[PDB]
Design an enzyme around this catalytic site. Structure first.
Site, PDB file in Angstrom:
ATOM      1  N   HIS A 125       0.829  -1.206   0.000  1.00 19.64           N
ATOM      2  CA  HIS A 125       0.000   0.000   0.000  1.00 19.64           C
ATOM      3  C   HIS A 125       0.855   1.244   0.000  1.00 19.64           C
ATOM      4  O   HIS A 125       1.961   1.276   0.561  1.00 19.64           O
ATOM      5  CB  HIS A 125      -0.906   0.113   1.229  1.00 19.64           C
ATOM      6  CG  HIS A 125      -1.513  -1.165   1.637  1.00 19.64           C
ATOM      7  ND1 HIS A 125      -1.074  -1.804   2.705  1.00 19.64           N
ATOM      8  CD2 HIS A 125      -2.499  -1.917   1.043  1.00 19.64           C
ATOM      9  CE1 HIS A 125      -1.761  -2.938   2.815  1.00 19.64           C
ATOM     10  NE2 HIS A 125      -2.653  -3.023   1.806  1.00 19.64           N
TER      11      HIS A 125
ATOM     12  N   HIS B 267       0.902   4.582   1.945  1.00 15.60           N
ATOM     13  CA  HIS B 267       0.445   5.207   3.164  1.00 15.60           C
ATOM     14  C   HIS B 267       0.567   6.713   3.050  1.00 15.60           C
ATOM     15  O   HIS B 267       1.313   7.224   2.239  1.00 15.60           O
ATOM     16  CB  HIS B 267       1.213   4.660   4.363  1.00 15.60           C
ATOM     17  CG  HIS B 267       0.895   3.218   4.690  1.00 15.60           C
ATOM     18  ND1 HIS B 267       0.359   2.868   5.879  1.00 15.60           N
ATOM     19  CD2 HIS B 267       0.993   2.046   3.955  1.00 15.60           C
ATOM     20  CE1 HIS B 267       0.193   1.522   5.885  1.00 15.60           C
ATOM     21  NE2 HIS B 267       0.565   1.016   4.724  1.00 15.60           N
TER      22      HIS B 267
ATOM     23  N   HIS C 270      -3.360   4.086   5.397  1.00 10.42           N
ATOM     24  CA  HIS C 270      -3.347   4.044   3.938  1.00 10.42           C
ATOM     25  C   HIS C 270      -3.741   5.410   3.385  1.00 10.42           C
ATOM     26  O   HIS C 270      -4.601   6.097   3.937  1.00 10.42           O
ATOM     27  CB  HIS C 270      -4.315   3.015   3.378  1.00 10.42           C
ATOM     28  CG  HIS C 270      -4.019   1.607   3.809  1.00 10.42           C
ATOM     29  ND1 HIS C 270      -4.823   0.558   3.462  1.00 10.42           N
ATOM     30  CD2 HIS C 270      -2.985   1.091   4.567  1.00 10.42           C
ATOM     31  CE1 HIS C 270      -4.294  -0.544   3.994  1.00 10.42           C
ATOM     32  NE2 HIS C 270      -3.202  -0.229   4.686  1.00 10.42           N
TER      33      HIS C 270
ATOM     34  N   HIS D  24     -11.339   0.589   2.945  1.00  8.36           N
ATOM     35  CA  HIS D  24     -10.295  -0.211   2.332  1.00  8.36           C
ATOM     36  C   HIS D  24     -10.875  -1.220   1.335  1.00  8.36           C
ATOM     37  O   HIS D  24     -11.937  -1.843   1.590  1.00  8.36           O
ATOM     38  CB  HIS D  24      -9.540  -0.943   3.428  1.00  8.36           C
ATOM     39  CG  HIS D  24      -8.434  -1.791   2.927  1.00  8.36           C
ATOM     40  ND1 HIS D  24      -7.243  -1.291   2.481  1.00  8.36           N
ATOM     41  CD2 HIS D  24      -8.380  -3.167   2.792  1.00  8.36           C
ATOM     42  CE1 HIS D  24      -6.520  -2.310   2.053  1.00  8.36           C
ATOM     43  NE2 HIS D  24      -7.185  -3.456   2.279  1.00  8.36           N
TER      44      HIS D  24
ATOM     45  N   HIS E 233      -9.197   2.668  -0.928  1.00  7.27           N
ATOM     46  CA  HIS E 233      -8.308   3.798  -0.701  1.00  7.27           C
ATOM     47  C   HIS E 233      -7.492   4.026  -1.981  1.00  7.27           C
ATOM     48  O   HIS E 233      -7.117   3.060  -2.661  1.00  7.27           O
ATOM     49  CB  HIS E 233      -7.349   3.483   0.434  1.00  7.27           C
ATOM     50  CG  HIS E 233      -8.028   3.141   1.717  1.00  7.27           C
ATOM     51  ND1 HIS E 233      -7.550   2.211   2.606  1.00  7.27           N
ATOM     52  CD2 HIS E 233      -9.120   3.725   2.295  1.00  7.27           C
ATOM     53  CE1 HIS E 233      -8.329   2.261   3.697  1.00  7.27           C
ATOM     54  NE2 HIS E 233      -9.284   3.165   3.506  1.00  7.27           N
TER      55      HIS E 233
ATOM     56  N   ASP F 225      -4.485   1.662  -2.118  1.00  7.82           N
ATOM     57  CA  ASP F 225      -4.693   0.207  -2.056  1.00  7.82           C
ATOM     58  C   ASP F 225      -4.203  -0.511  -3.311  1.00  7.82           C
ATOM     59  O   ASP F 225      -4.912  -0.609  -4.303  1.00  7.82           O
ATOM     60  CB  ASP F 225      -6.173  -0.086  -1.827  1.00  7.82           C
ATOM     61  CG  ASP F 225      -6.625   0.244  -0.433  1.00  7.82           C
ATOM     62  OD1 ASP F 225      -5.736   0.438   0.475  1.00  7.82           O
ATOM     63  OD2 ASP F 225      -7.845   0.327  -0.205  1.00  7.82           O
TER      64      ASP F 225
ATOM     65  N   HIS G  16       3.745  -5.307   3.837  1.00  7.52           N
ATOM     66  CA  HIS G  16       3.267  -5.756   5.135  1.00  7.52           C
ATOM     67  C   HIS G  16       3.576  -7.224   5.439  1.00  7.52           C
ATOM     68  O   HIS G  16       3.888  -8.026   4.553  1.00  7.52           O
ATOM     69  CB  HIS G  16       1.745  -5.544   5.228  1.00  7.52           C
ATOM     70  CG  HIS G  16       1.375  -4.111   5.393  1.00  7.52           C
ATOM     71  ND1 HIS G  16       1.099  -3.564   6.599  1.00  7.52           N
ATOM     72  CD2 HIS G  16       1.228  -3.090   4.473  1.00  7.52           C
ATOM     73  CE1 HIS G  16       0.802  -2.264   6.446  1.00  7.52           C
ATOM     74  NE2 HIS G  16       0.861  -1.981   5.156  1.00  7.52           N
TER      75      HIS G  16
ATOM     76  N   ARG H  15       4.506  -3.696   9.475  1.00  6.30           N
ATOM     77  CA  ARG H  15       5.175  -3.076   8.331  1.00  6.30           C
ATOM     78  C   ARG H  15       6.597  -3.618   8.227  1.00  6.30           C
ATOM     79  O   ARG H  15       7.459  -3.297   9.037  1.00  6.30           O
ATOM     80  CB  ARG H  15       5.183  -1.557   8.507  1.00  6.30           C
ATOM     81  CG  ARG H  15       3.769  -1.040   8.678  1.00  6.30           C
ATOM     82  CD  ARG H  15       3.659   0.441   8.902  1.00  6.30           C
ATOM     83  NE  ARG H  15       2.246   0.720   9.160  1.00  6.30           N
ATOM     84  CZ  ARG H  15       1.689   1.919   9.081  1.00  6.30           C
ATOM     85  NH1 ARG H  15       2.379   2.997   8.771  1.00  6.30           N
ATOM     86  NH2 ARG H  15       0.390   1.996   9.269  1.00  6.30           N
TER      87      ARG H  15
HETATM   88 CU   LIG Z   1       0.051  -0.639   4.034  1.00  9.08          CU
HETATM   89 ZN   LIG Z   2      -6.453   0.570   2.286  1.00 10.96          ZN
END
Ligand SMILES: [Cu+2]
Ligand SMILES: [Zn+2]
Ligand SMILES: CNC[C@H](O)c1ccc(O)c(O)c1
Ligand SMILES: CNC[C@H](O)c1ccc(O)c(O)c1
Ligand SMILES: [Cu+2]
Ligand SMILES: [Zn+2]
Lengths: 153, 153
Positions: free
Chosen positions: B46, B48, B63, B71, B80, B83, B120, B143
């Site tokens: 993602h 962020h 995100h 999400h 998002h 995403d 992640h 993360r």
């Molecule tokens: Cu992420």
């Molecule tokens: Zn998301």
């Protein structure tokens, strides 16, 4: 206000954290933070064009220069947008950074976000060194630490 | 046309390098590269919000979600902007990243440059996991590695 931040790292001992804040659109930018692991004295301090760290700080390219000017100091009219002069380390090896600049921005064509902040080996002569390289790099030498400037909360 | 790049760092090493290219500002962004040091399987991937890695990848915040949506996966309308789904690693620990996405951009309000790319710990359930947290993070866990997305040459 708009804010940005940069974590400086490299291959050796130099590391730091630098914050940026711009109170109003197109206005001056406050730059503050700390860098450690430095030799005592002046170290060139610039925004370089690319936020590319693929192969380390070299990947960042030349000083950020959207207006095609010669290198100078931050208080010169003839400067690159990225020309933030020098930071100064004391005998602790720490530079306490506190700058206000009227040419960098956190938006628009002068925007430094997504580009690389670099702290250099040597002093920047602010374009007053009298060789050709003075009006390109300031003779500040190698790149000790760098990071990509990011949008902050 | 426009290019960006991100160096991902992270213990394992989980390390990677991710390239972005957008042939025109109104157009899709190609995302490609490699990430190594991963456990076999899916890893959430993602953009962020913040390009802040002051205290590590946690400093990057949630995100990137300029439109205030829940999400989802990259194919979903309800997602998002940040995403990008999952990258999938083989037994050798390597994920080959090859994504085209029409929602992220390298210009405008949905610009991801200056923000943080994160890989992640766990799979992203693409908002289909059935608990509340599926609708915020996809339950993708911690993360492993991150970097600030920078302007490239
Ligand atoms: Cu992420
Ligand atoms: Zn998301
Ligand atoms: C951390 N506080 C920064 C202050 O608000 C500030 C000072 C000088 C400036 O030019 C500026 O844009 C902001
Ligand atoms: C890129 N920096 C612009 C500067 O902060 C600035 C702001 C307003 C002005 O009227 C001006 O001449 C200069
Ligand atoms: Cu420099
Ligand atoms: Zn310069």
């Amino acid at each position: 206000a708009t804010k940005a931040v940069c974590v400086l790292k490299g291959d050796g001992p130099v590391q730091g954290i630098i914050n940026f804040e711009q109170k109003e659109s197109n206005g001056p930018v406050k730059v503050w933070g700390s860098i450690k692991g430095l030799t005592e004295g002046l170290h060139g301090f610039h925004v370089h064009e690319f936020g590319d760290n693929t192969a380390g700080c070299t990947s960042a390219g030349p000083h950020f220069n959207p207006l095609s000017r010669k290198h100078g100091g931050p208080k010169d009219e003839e400067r690159h947008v990225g020309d933030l002069g020098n930071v100064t380390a004391d005998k602790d090896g720490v530079a306490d950074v506190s700058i206000e600049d009227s040419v960098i921005s956190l938006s628009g064509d002068h925007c430094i976000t997504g580009r690389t902040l670099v702290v250099h080996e040597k002093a920047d002569d602010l374009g007053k060194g009298g060789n050709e390289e003075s009006t390109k790099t300031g003779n500040a030498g190698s790149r000790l630490a760098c990071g990509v400037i990011g949008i902050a909360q």
